[PDB]
Amino acid sequence: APATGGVCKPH
Amino acid sequence: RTFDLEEKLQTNKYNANFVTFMEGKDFNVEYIQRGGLRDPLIFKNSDGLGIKMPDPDFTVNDVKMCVGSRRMVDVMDVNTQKGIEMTMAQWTRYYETPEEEREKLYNVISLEFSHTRLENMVQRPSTVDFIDWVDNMWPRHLKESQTESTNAILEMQYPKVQKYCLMSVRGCYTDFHVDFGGTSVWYHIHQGGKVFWLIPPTAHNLELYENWLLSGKQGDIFLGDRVSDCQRIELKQGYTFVIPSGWIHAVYTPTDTLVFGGNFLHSFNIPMQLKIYSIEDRTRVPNKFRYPFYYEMCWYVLERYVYCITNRSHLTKDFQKESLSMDME
Amino acid sequence: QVHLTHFELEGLRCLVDKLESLPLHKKCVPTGIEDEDALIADVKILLEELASSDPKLALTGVPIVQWP
Ligand SMILES: *CCCCCCC(=O)N(O)CCC(=O)O
Ligand SMILES: [Fe+3]
């Protein structure tokens, strides 16, 4: 799967 | 989750006063220069903020048609606080399902819609544009070159963190966190409502926060009990909320809701920004959940300051040329 | 002659100290930057010269950094 950035989630 | 979220919503103990209610017209660059954007703000109406929102009855199916039925969206499983992935069309079907028919509670908090049709329907507060590092510091020819509307890192030409759509069903809860990179956040309740628990970024509370993350016992401990002081506050429909760098916060959704918001770094609370970044590093946050190109941006910030003050450029010749061409448009 | 806020002066000294102290494999010098050591050197000079910024006069209502 392609890598993502700027994903909002706790921990 | 072994703590009872219903008592955390009913108790009167989260009674600190951290938030300032402001009129939009007073939220300007002078205010930021004088205050350093240190205080959480609520704007009960949008007069003077310079926002634009879509039509007031805009639905999740409208969001879907603007970004694409086949757009992959990160969804949060509320019970676990872990991520899964589905298409926007699948998300829409879940959201349009009656409450009693939904198997689990899922929340979408991470749909960045820059470079889609939805982008021009939403404008953030004007003052943010004047101080956002993305708009003011990142090489403009890079930003303008972005074509990808997803957050695929290999296609990303700048930190694509400016405009997010959040879609939350009744009962959703996001556990305590600090927004990525120590970003400040603007957050507009287009429809529905949210309840926030707010905890200030004192050195003591940030140590508790890191310790709570390193313990792995976040399902077991409600952090707002472990701190010195915590404000629980309700945001209603049409309010706009600004959260300063480093504020530790958790959110509950009492009704189906749609939110538009976004992240920004700025030059008035750099120390806190760096501090948050270093908590992410030490607690081993995967890059996926962090501010893209963070240190890169910081280098560009130094260059812009030097250039604007002394007129000495530390950009490559080619980047100087790209910038000059843009100055002539 | 220019007046920065103390927020910015403090911030920029943190920033320079931070980037200068990262090792090569974590520095993330971006592709647009020419000589990052000379940029650092310059920021240090600049912050010394701006250390006497008048907090009143810095409250201009206009950011220092803007595109022309
Ligand atoms: C990172 C995306 C912009 C800020 C909104 C997500 C977030 O971090 N929240 O605190 C809101 C969580 C929620 O509404 O459930
Ligand atoms: Fe948040």
Taking an 8 Å cut-off on Cβ atoms, the answer to whether B153 and A9 are in contact is: no
Q: Does domain B5-328 have CATH number 2.60.120.650?
A: yes
**At a CB cut-off of 8 Å and minimum separation 6, what does B233 contact?**
B19, B42, B195, B196, B198
DSSP code of residue B237: T
Spell out which residues have Cβ within 5 A of ligand 2, the ion. Answer: B 179
Beta bridge partners of B126: none
Residue type, B225: D
Q: Which residues contact B323 (CB under 8 A, 6 or more apart)?
A: B139, B140, B141, B315
Burial B40-65 (b: 16+ CB within 10 A, else e): bbbbeebebbebebbeeebbbebbbe
Question: CB of B166 closer than 6 A to ligand 1?
Answer: yes
Q: Which of residues 1-11 of A touch B (CB under 8 A)?
A: 2-11
Q: CA-CA distance, B139 to B326, in Å (whole number)? A: 10
**Distance of residue B83 Cα from the nearest chain A Cα, in angstroms:** 8
Element (H, E) at B241: strand B240-243
How many CA atoms lie within 13 Å of C1's alpha carbon, on the beta-carbon side? 2
Query: Which of B112, B209, B276, B291 to probe by mutation at the A interface, max A CB count within 10 Å?
Result: B112
The pair phi, psi for residue B112, each rounded to 5°, is -85, 120
Q: In chain C, where are the structural domains located?
A: 1-68
Q: In whole angstroms, what is the distance from residue B82 CA to residue B125 CA?
A: 31
How far apart CA C10 and CA C47 sit, in angstroms, is 9
Answer whether C9 touches B (CB < 8 Å).
Answer: no
Helix, coil or strand: residue B195: strand
CA angle B264, B268, B274 (to 5 degrees): 70
Q: Where are the domains of chain B?
A: 5-328
**Maximum Cα–Cα distance across chain B:** 63
Q: Is B168 in the pocket of ligand 1 (CB under 6 A)?
A: yes
Please tell me the distance in Å from C51's CA to the nearest CA on chain B. 14
With beta carbons under 8 A apart, name residues in chain A contacting B156.
5-6
How far is Cα C68 from Cα C63, in angstroms, rounded to an integer? 12
Distance CA B260, CA B41 (A): 16
Phi first, then psi, for residue B18 (nearest 5°) are -105, -20
